[PDB]
Each structure stands twice: as structure tokens, then as C-alpha cells.
Swiss-Prot record:
Annotated function: May be required for DNA interstrand cross-link repair. Also required for checkpoint mediated cell cycle arrest in early prophase in response to mitotic spindle poisons. Possesses beta-lactamase activity, catalyzing the hydrolysis of penicillin G and nitrocefin. Exhibits no activity towards other beta-lactam antibiotic classes including cephalosporins (cefotaxime) and carbapenems (imipenem).
Gene from which this protein is expressed: DCLRE1A
Origin species: Homo sapiens (Human)
Name recorded for this polypeptide: DNA cross-link repair 1A protein
Record's subunit section: Binds constitutively to TP53BP1. Binds CDC27, which is itself a component of the anaphase promoting complex (APC). Binds PIAS1.
Tissue spec: Expressed in brain, heart, kidney, liver, pancreas, placenta and skeletal muscle.
Family: Belongs to the DNA repair metallo-beta-lactamase (DRMBL) family.
Lineage: Eukaryota, Metazoa, Chordata, Craniata, Vertebrata
Induction: During mitosis. The mRNA encoding this protein contains an internal ribosome entry site (IRES) in its 5'-UTR. This 5'-UTR generally suppresses translation while specifically promoting expression during mitosis, when cap-dependent translation may be impaired.
Amino acid sequence: TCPFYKKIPGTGFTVDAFQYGVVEGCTAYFLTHFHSDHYAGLSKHFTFPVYCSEITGNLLKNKLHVQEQYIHPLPLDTECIVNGVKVVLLDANHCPGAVMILFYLPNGTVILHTGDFRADPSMERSLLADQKVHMLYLDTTYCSPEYTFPSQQEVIRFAINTAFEAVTLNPHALVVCGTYSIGKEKVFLAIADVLGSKVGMSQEKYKTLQCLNIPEINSLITTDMCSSLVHLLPMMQINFKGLQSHLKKCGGKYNQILAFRPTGWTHSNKFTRIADVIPQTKGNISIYGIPYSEHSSYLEMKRFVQWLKPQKIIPTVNVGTWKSRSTMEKYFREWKLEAGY
Ligand code: NI
């Protein structure tokens, strides 16, 4: 049945709650972003109102074939009324189209649901600064102090310089980047840009990216693999077997693969700096795991909450075990005592 942390009190609303069948008394289903754990259950047979960003609405229509009449896209940073309740969608700094949702309850309570987010100081200057938030439904994916990672900028710098060096030394090297969902497009787009190539991909992935309002996308991506030296593949195929195979398919155009796997976190972060990352190599194939995250680090998350000063925090991730729930609650208390709220 629908968990409490997907229900918005004082409303008929749910957030990211599409796999429970008809939720009793739900009048509007909100979707924060187009990732499968959140959209699971939508299809062309869904006949309730779905509220979301424009980009998420493009992906619902084109990829899942949801009918137009049930998709209600809203502009960002704009006060809107939904079943008589004022709402605002804010940029979540997650994947394309991902939003946070501010609800202004008729009784005066103000609720922020972060969806999935990567907290950033820029958020401290959006419409959030203008009023107090009483309840926060928080993306706690990496809510433990061992989760540190570099900025997105530093990670792309590493990937560009690595790819550019390799291909300049060997003009017959192929670059491959793994993907399994939208997000992290900057990885493959920045590499193609430095190399003066388009990124080649399957028809299904080219379709997905054409839904995202990315400026000058017809200029950066293509379904012609032959004319491209940056290839995108499913994340599952980013291993020595899968890559030796792909190389066979390129018909002696290439003699070396350099591959990137943008993971969220991996324990090499606790020790290793970004400067100090090395690949796994077999034969003429090298694989780099880079820590490109679209979720908050522990320190980024802590700053955001100590800035916002909510009266109540409701975690949405890692809620399935008592030890996790209990540990998160202890961090929330420290933050509150250190900051004085
Ligand atoms: Ni997500």
C-alpha cells in the first residue's frame, strides 16, 4: 500500500506514487522526474491527472504513450493553483526535467518535497528564501558522512582532459560512455565537444534525448555510429566482454577503447582524490569509474537543511531498515543543535 512519505497532508495529493494502483482519495498525482523507480506504473492506460515539468511531460507522452489530456505540465518558478492549492515547481539540480515541489496548504503550513536533488547554494536564492517551510520531505540517498564527492565541474574536467589526451595520442581510439536512464548527459556531451565529434547512439536513446529541450542538440547527437567517435551504450555493456564485442562490430575502424562509467558513489572516494583516479585495463580496453553524482553529498545536504531550518524532516530514501532510519534521525538532531533551530 502507499507509504505515508508519498502523501501530502491536508490535500488530495501524492508524489511519485504510481505503482500502488488507485490510491484512495488521491485527486492529483505529482511526478518529480522521469526515473523508473519514480514513474513505475504509468502507461497509456492511466486516466488520472499527472502534474509535472514540461520536459517530464514530453517524456510521458513520447516514451510511455500517456495521453495528452491527462498530462498537466507546469512552468518552473511560477505560482500555480492545483485543485485549489497553490504550488510552485523549483529546479532540483538532478536529471533533466527534475523538480522540487512547494505546497502552500490552505491552513498556512508550507511543505517542500525535494524529489531527487543535488543541493546547491543557488537554491538559497530561489522562491524558497521568501517564506518559512514547516515540513521537508528530503532526498536522503547519501545521508552519511562517508559520502563525499567532487563537484560536477571537477569531474567533467577530468573526463575531458583524459579523453582529449588519449585520442590525440591515438587517433584510432574509440571513446564509449555508459548510460541507463536520463541524467549525466554532460559527461558524453562535453567529451564529444572537445573531440569535434557527435555522440552516436541507438534510435531509442536519440528519441529520449530529443524530448529534453537541450539547446543545439541536433548539433551534438546522431544515430549514425559510423560517423561518430564517442559511442553511448547501455551501462550493462560497460565491461571487458561487452566492450571487446562492440569493438568487433566497428570493423577495424578502431584499435583501442577508452570507456567511462559515471557511478554515483564508490568507496575509492574515502581515500582517492579526482586527480588520483586510474582505470582498470585489459588488453587494449580501459574502463574509468568516475564519481559524477546527481544527488547531494552529506555536507551539501547538511548545509541546505541548516539554511532552511524546517520544523519536521521526513526522509524519502533508505527508510526500509531501522538502523538507517535511526542513524538519519541522529544526524538531523545534530544539525539542528549545531545551527540553533
Ligand atoms: Ni532519480
